[PDB]
Design a protein around this ligand. Structure first.
Ligand SMILES: Nc1nc2c([nH]c(=O)n2[C@H]2C[C@H](O)[C@@H](COP(=O)(O)OP(=O)(O)OP(=O)(O)O)O2)c(=O)[nH]1
Ligand SMILES: [Cl-]
Ligand SMILES: [Cl-]
Ligand SMILES: [Mg+2]
Length: 290
């Protein structure tokens, strides 16, 4: 069987230092990570396990990649992120007895596994002090036929509401701070739970609906960049016919290659920016899908 895990290169400003952990079970030095709990998304697992193992909270930025290796039971699949420490301090735990903070070249030496070393090379290849734009497709909301009444008003269904609730921890893992949604009830409702958590209002965005994108895709592009330019990490909840077009455009111009792709309801594109420039685009499946 495949064991799914997530973790990070945890970093702080000293130029940058990264955490390497020691485990007496293997007398090994490695990166903080662990297994996904039932129902848990990779980002949320990563944040948890980082804090379990290092004693630090972190905000996840760019996704580093996936690595896969044999273990006695089968196969270990681990997703890694760059993650900046937001606080805390190490104290020894059950698995991890020591942690060191190292500049990257020394950390590469301290590491011992090829997969960890690969992830660390991925970390250094781009800027890590990134800002993050979270582009979310609204949750499940039945079919446009099944709900007559102004389709603008069609609500999230039971699943979609559960997706919205699950997106709170997902989006908070990336340090979401400001909320925007296309002018459709289902788009707002997707991020209402996060709005309440953050105690933030949701900015309504008539230029980012499907109808508006179809009429004037250029105004949508410009408005996306306007939003991305504001301070904070914005969530922008919009629709299925809008997202691929915006993401594809921006990735092509920035020469950013996504490691994964898709467009499902409740999915999230994590766009990482350095000094306003796009440097990563990471598609996350819906929180209730694999
Ligand atoms: N942490 C880590 N372990 C690895 C890598 N490559 C590699 O063969 N291993 C080995 C170390 C162990 O002998 C074996 C399983 O270690 P593990 O850290 O993946 O799994 P674990 O279940 O003991 O710990 P975890 O997922 O709960 O943190 O795999 C790697 O890149 N990182
Ligand atoms: Cl520490
Ligand atoms: Cl829909
Ligand atoms: Mg672990």
């Amino acid at each position: 069987h495949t064991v799914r895990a997530a973790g990070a290169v945890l970093w702080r400003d000293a130029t940058v230092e990264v955490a390497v952990i020691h485990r007496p079970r293997y007398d090994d030095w490695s990166l903080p990570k662990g297994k996904l709990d039932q129902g848990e998304t990779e980002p949320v697992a990563a944040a948890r396990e980082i804090h379990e193992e290092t004693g630090h909270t972190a905000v996840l930025g760019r996704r580093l990649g996936r690595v896969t290796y044999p273990i006695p039971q089968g196969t270990k699949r681990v997703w890694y992120w760059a993650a900046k420490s937001t606080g805390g301090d190490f104290s020894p735990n059950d698995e991890v007895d020591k942690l060191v903070w190292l500049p990257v070249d020394a950390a590469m030496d301290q590491l011992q596994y090829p997969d960890d070393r690969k992830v660390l090379r991925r970390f250094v290849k781009r800027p890590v002090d990134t800002k993050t734009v979270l582009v979310v497709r609204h949750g499940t909301a039945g079919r446009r036929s099944r709900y007559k009444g102004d389709d603008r008003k069609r609500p999230l269904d039971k699943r979609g509401r559960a997706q919205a609730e699950a997106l709170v921890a997902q989006l908070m893992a990336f340090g979401a701070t400001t909320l925007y949604a296309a002018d459709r009830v289902r788009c707002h409702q997707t991020i209402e739970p996060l709005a309440q958590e953050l105690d933030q209002l949701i900015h309504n965005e008539p230029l980012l609906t499907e109808e508006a994108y179809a009429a004037d895709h250029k105004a949508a592009r410009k408005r996306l960049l306007e939003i991305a330019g504001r301070p904070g990490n914005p969530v922008i909840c919009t629709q299925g016919k809008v997202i691929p077009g915006l993401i594809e455009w921006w990735c092509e111009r920035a020469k950013v290659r996504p490691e994964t792709t898709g467009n499902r309801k409740g999915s999230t594109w994590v766009l990482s920016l350095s000094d306003g420039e796009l440097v990563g685009a990471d598609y996350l499946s819906p929180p209730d899908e694999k």
